[PDB]
From a paper:
The Clp protease system is important for maintaining proteostasis in bacteria. It consists of ClpP serine proteases and an AAA+ Clp-ATPase such as ClpC1. The hexameric ATPase ClpC1 utilizes the energy of ATP binding and hydrolysis to engage, unfold, and translocate substrates into the proteolytic chamber of homo- or hetero-tetradecameric ClpP for degradation. Here, we present cryo-EM structures of the substrate-bound ClpC1:shClpP1P2 from Streptomyces hawaiiensis, and shClpP1P2 in complex with ADEP1, a natural compound produced by S. hawaiiensis and known to cause over-activation and dysregulation of the ClpP proteolytic core chamber.
Numbering used by the authors:
A (entry chain F), D (entry chain A), E (entry chain B), F (entry chain C), G (entry chain D), I (entry chain E): 31 to 208
B (entry chain I), H (entry chain J), J (entry chain K), K (entry chain L), L (entry chain M): 51 to 226
C (entry chain S), M (entry chain O), N (entry chain P), O (entry chain U), P (entry chain Q), Q (entry chain R), ...: 2 to 7
Write the structure that this text describes.
């Protein structure tokens, strides 16, 4: 009773919560909410990220529906923003990405597992490599860093404090206080 | 163990486990080994078993029937299902039991695997023919007629030493 | 979170 | 629930679904719905079949309650109609059985498992044989094929397209477009 | 939502469904429904049976509350009526028991399991034999067959179609059409 | 489901079911219902019992609640009444206890499991013996039998039909018809 | 459905049930109910105890919120009151603690399990001993017994009837009838 | 293992496990092998077992009663129902027990599998007859009347060395 | 329905419960409730803690939300406040932190599990060390103790009652009665 | 293994596992074999065990008492429950322990299974009598009186080498 | 296997498993067996173990101390707490380690059972006394004072060959 | 089995399983036994294993380093992690591989359990030191400098026979 | 089922 | 169940 | 499905 | 439970 | 908890 | 079992 | 066990 | 363990 | 493997 | 391990 | 998604 | 099985 009520009353203020690992169901719900709030094209949409990551395809669906509409999307990071979470975080409208002072941002290149015959393993291997290159190019475009710099930095997992994230280019500014 | 091997040279064979493929193979191998020896010497089979499989049943019965030396059987503690007809399958005049023996006779139990009705019909017909063969085989080994077995075997029946002697399953009860 | 979101 | 809403409205129109293996619960619900719609003795009933079949007794309860009422029942096969599903599909009133162009029908032989003593196995064996004969006679009566032809074709599983089912007599006609 | 709605709207027509194995909670529910419908002392109560049977005590509770009240109980068998199901079927008001043409009725003999010391096994054995004799006498009284005839017939499971069950005394008449 | 509103409508007539093993939850429900119906002090409270028994403490709480109020409690046994069930059955107001003709009453002796060191096991042993003695004394007081007669009769499980339970003293009278 | 409106209407009479082992959830719920009923500072609050006890911390939270408020709390024990249950029972306002004649009260010494290195096990050992001393002192303060008497009687589990509890000091008085 | 066989050449038999088919077969094979030698030498058996199946129990009892040589039986540590009746089944006047030995007697416990009420009736009558034969044999081997055994067997009964000696289950308690 | 009702009517009084281990879901709920109550910039928000701990990122999200809003947050600890619980308890507005007389506070050191190759283990090791230093500095700033004192005291688990926690600096004042 | 067999010749018996039926059976089998080999030379028992059952405890104790030659016993590392009483059960004046030994005496523990309250009463009386016998027989082998055992056994008690020597469990501690 | 016994005849003992009852029992059985021959020959113990139980290591240590022949220890591969204390328990001047060996010292860890708080108090005092005794004994076999190793034992400490030599746990590190 | 011992008389040792405590102990015992004979005969180690533990790795490595006789190694099938470094640890000029052999080198993988931050820091520092020591010691046995070694080891690297020969892990590839 | 039920 | 309950 | 169902 | 609670 | 919260 | 088997 | 068994 | 056992 | 090992 | 152990 | 869906 | 196998 509490959760549904508070989520409804917050959504009434054009606020979307992403507080769980990204999968198909939550991605579909967020896409539906974004489309619904897209009815009014002159009001910004605010998205709060607290998630340890999720599937690639669902995150890319959310990313595409985020940049499809004219409505500006303002992302706020609280707690943890890792893997696909930080990718959605940095995908917001330029100049409108913020994080809390103690929020942590984890840059995490994709991981997956494959099985089958040699040809199937091959095909899935080039598909995974193409997906990784796609992610690297998108991150380089969004953050303003050079593509090879992002590729070098994304070889291992990297942790970022709010100020380091601001310096790197993932986040435009840091919420100090109300 | 050592006692089993030592009793082996005395032409004494234990049947103390459930009847199945391995035990039947061992029992019939021992029967063949003993008959390959002096064929004028009897072979004693001590039975203490709650029954078991069926193909093992028939294999051991046929092996006993084929062997020229007379084979005597002694009930021991309990003889049920397969063990009952092994005990009753000994040569006439050489079936024995202990005073506190416990003999059980019951019709065969089976579980036909699931499938389309043609397979179940085939399996059920085979089970019925098997049951008919067993009632005939037990009838020819006992004084009771076929119909008496028809009333008796429909449910489980339990006989003691004196009851088995009167019925005809055994020939004599051991006293001392 | 206003200002400025909301 | 949205699904409950759409089933409620479609039942309100005239329609009854069957989209899972036939068991006691779904058969009871379908029998209740048929009895409820039987209140009007003029409007016909429509039954949509998409199921891989189920228990014989539940299917026969549904068949009997279909045959009981004056209201004509029109069966439409969509997707898969197998085992008791195709029997119910063929159970519809003559001239009012239809299938979609890509509908697929499977004629199947009854199967069951048995256990117990010899006498119980016997009794259940004649019961299963009687059930099989009953089903074969009913199918021969409904489809118009000769009894030995039906019992010969039902020896093994047989697959049917829409046009093959129409030719065989299982289906009166196949629809193409609205 | 469908099942509850249809069951409610059928209950307003004084129709009771028994479409599952008989146990404690369903027996209490059916007893409550029978008592509720007993408020009107002239309208009869119609009970539909489709069940493979269940516990002895619950069935006897339903039986006692069935012949407690003045209201006539009309039993209709659909699908399968076995073990306690057929007992409840034949327990209806004389001249008001019916079955569908393809309904199967199974006369079955009680079965249970026992555990404990010798004295406990004994006591439960006489109790179970007394239950057997109670059932045999009750069904002999209801059907019209003699006690030993029922006892010999009930030694093993017995199957019945509509017509042979009708002539055996289990069922007064068989339904044909609406 | 039908159960909720049928139970509410029956409770509107001062009817309470005990149709499951006795534990803490059902005991709390029954005590609350008894207290609620105790608001009117001139109407009887009717308790229908069909249960195989349960924990001693919950049954004793229910018994104390029954004995506390001035409202007369009429206990009717249907189906099975065993262990704590028959105790609550015989705990009703004198002259106001009834059973159905085919109801079974099982006089049962308490059983429990013990664990721990040789000193804790002792204490739990005398506690269990004291509970046994109190149960025997209460049964003797309620049924009119002597202490030693109840003690010797309760050594093993004992079964009673309606009439011999009436003769024993467990039941005031047996129901015949409406 | 049923089982909740009774609790609502009993809470409307300032009655609180504790019918399950004491854990965090039930402790928070009872604390909230106590604070809610504390809005009116002149009407007493009645707490019914039937539980085998639970965690120490939850019971202590309930205890502290009981003696925080001005409202006098009256404890009634039915069935079983053990471990934390009897502590809450005896924690009531002096002169306003009662038990039913057949209720049982178990004085139980706290128990727990520890794991880890030597230092961690040490620290948790002194914490458990401090909790033991705290409980003994509080019980002695509430019941009027001396520290030595309580700490010697609580070495092992002890059982109490209503009258034994009254004599000891755990219960002010025992009720018989309304 | 080596001490077991080494004690075995001294006509000493251990019964240290639960009674079942395998142990009964092994122990009675040992009995037969030991009596195969001169029957003028006693066979000593030491009992330490919590009991077991009744059929194997009866098999061991019968094979003890059949052989001519007298049998010493000595309780050691603890002897439950089947162990108790084996211990009481020794040759009269020559059955002993240890000072701290524990003897326990209780009526047989059984588990009738679920099934047809006729099958349950047959199994229940068999259990009743088996138990009745059990106390008949126990009263035969003891000095107490059968009715006394009936009263004392309805629950578990535990006796010490002196209690067993007084009751008649034991003829002598060895001290040192 | 009781728990939801009481929680709603308490939330209408600007009271928030944290009565379970801190994870993502409860952290999101607390953040949403804090933002919702932040609509009025003059009324303080009261937060009650009975928790055994939880995750780090969720607790830091809650802490950042508490620090961001202009409304004063008054923290009350009852029962147990450990790990993240005591951090949130001491994170309240100065002069507005309280505990019940029998409240128990546990100062704890962060713990986690690591897996992977040497480089990943290394990176997560510095991340954990940085998190521990962050926590130590924050709690030293909030309580008033020096960094070295906190580091020495937080090496192992430490326990505090109400008064010694007040002396340490974790709690501003302890309440006794209403 | 080879070392156990080699040490067997010098009348040294290990008890390094939990006390149960099989280990106890082996123990008194070896004790009887050593009795047979020579009745005039002592038997040494090295105890390192956490405890075990009680019936096996009493069986080993009675075997030790019955053996005419004295039984040396030394504790090694850790002895509790059955191990503690068995170590205390050695011949007077000839019981030893290592300098870093660890002796534990604790009240017996069991598990009374689910059943009718009469059965639980019988089991409770039996365990209480077992407790009383154990304490009396332990106080017999020590200078401390019975009631002292009452205070000292109600909970677990732990004694080192010097503590055991002073209390009476151990006659002398081995130095080097 | 053959290599183990073959190395055994040259008075070489492996400890390559976790420390528990069976391994420790075998260890001091072999120690006593080697003691059986001339006491002028040293005993070499090769230690590669992640440690284990405390009572077992204490028993092995006591046996090592009781043996008059000097015992030398060689660490190689790894040595955890039990292995570390056994390795440091060798005779002075005869403790060696391989150049790339790893030594680990940490305070004892245990899982005290759930129970009455009095039982937990007793167990906690016992484990504290055990830790104090272990650290005192470790300080005995090293040049470092007791307070130094009490500080160094609070957490896990890992030392290499040279670090162990400097600390005092190893007399010398062998090279070729 | 017979061929293993038969090859064993010819100073040939198989390493065909995962590296752990038992296999390492067997290998080191065999190495010691072989060197106990005339130290002028080489020892051949045939390696086909996917790796294993690191402590056992080091034990076998420095056991090979300690003995005077030259140790030659031959790879078969594959050699990963522990197997690769053991193969590279042979006597210079005496490392061989088959034409289709596979060599895999990768940095150590660890599973550090849950604990406080201090424990994680200690374990992580130990893991880093272990990996640094391993890479330094591998660079010692190869012509490539340490810089190239920790450039290459960061991910998995797989080399064939010719690749291993060019890298410096193998002195010569077996042809026919 | 009318007629005649209902 | 009337008469007489209810 | 009209025409003709519905 | 009145009297006297409630 | 008033006073003073609430 | 002699006599007479064997 | 001699005397007297054996 | 000699002396003196054995 | 001779030549040359062994 | 000789020299010098053994 | 308008234009043009919706 | 002789005769005649073997």
């Amino acid at each position: 009773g509490l959760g549904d009520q508070v989520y409804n009353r917050l959504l009434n203020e054009r606020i979307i919560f992403l507080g769980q690992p990204v999968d198909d169901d939550i991605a579909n719900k967020i896409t539906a909410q974004l489309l619904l709030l897209a009815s009014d094209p002159e009001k910004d949409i605010y998205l709060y990220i607290n998630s340890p990551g999720g599937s690639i395809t669902a995150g890319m669906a959310i990313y595409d529906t985020m940049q499809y509409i004219k409505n500006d999307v303002v992302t706020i990071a609280m707690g943890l923003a890792a893997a696909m979470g930080q990718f959605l975080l940095s995908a917001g409208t330029p100049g409108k990405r913020f994080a809390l002072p103690n929020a942590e941002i984890l840059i995490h290149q994709p991981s997956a597992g494959l099985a089958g015959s040699a040809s199937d393993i091959k095909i899935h291997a080039e598909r995974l490599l193409h997906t990784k290159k796609r992610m690297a190019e998108l991150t380089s475009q969004h953050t303003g860093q050079t593509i090879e710099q992002i590729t070098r930095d994304s070889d291992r997992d990297r942790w970022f404090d709010a100020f380091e994230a601001k310096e790197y280019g993932l986040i435009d500014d840091v919420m100090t206080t109300a | 163990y050592d006692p089993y091997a030592k009793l082996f040279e005395e032409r004494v064979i234990f049947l103390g486990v459930q009847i199945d493929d391995a035990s039947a193979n061992d029992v019939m191998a021992q029967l063949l080994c003993l008959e390959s020896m002096d064929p004028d010497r009897d072979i004693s089979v001590y039975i203490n078993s709650p029954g078991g499989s069926f193909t093992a049943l028939t294999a051991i019965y046929d092996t006993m029937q084929y062997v020229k030396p007379d084979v005597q059987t002694v009930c021991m503690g309990q003889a049920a299902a397969a063990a009952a007809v092994l005990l009753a399958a000994g040569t006439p005049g050489k079936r024995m039991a202990l005073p506190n023996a416990r003999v059980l006779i019951h019709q065969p139990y089976s579980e036909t695997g699931r499938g389309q009705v043609s397979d179940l019909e085939i399996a059920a017909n085979e089970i019925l023919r098997m049951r008919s063969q067993l009632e005939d085989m037990l009838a020819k080994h006992s004084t009771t007629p076929v119909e008496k077995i028809r009333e008796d075997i429909e449910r489980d029946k339990i006989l003691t030493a004196e009851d088995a002697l009167s019925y005809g399953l055994i020939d004599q009860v051991i006293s001392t | 979170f206003s200002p400025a979101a909301p």
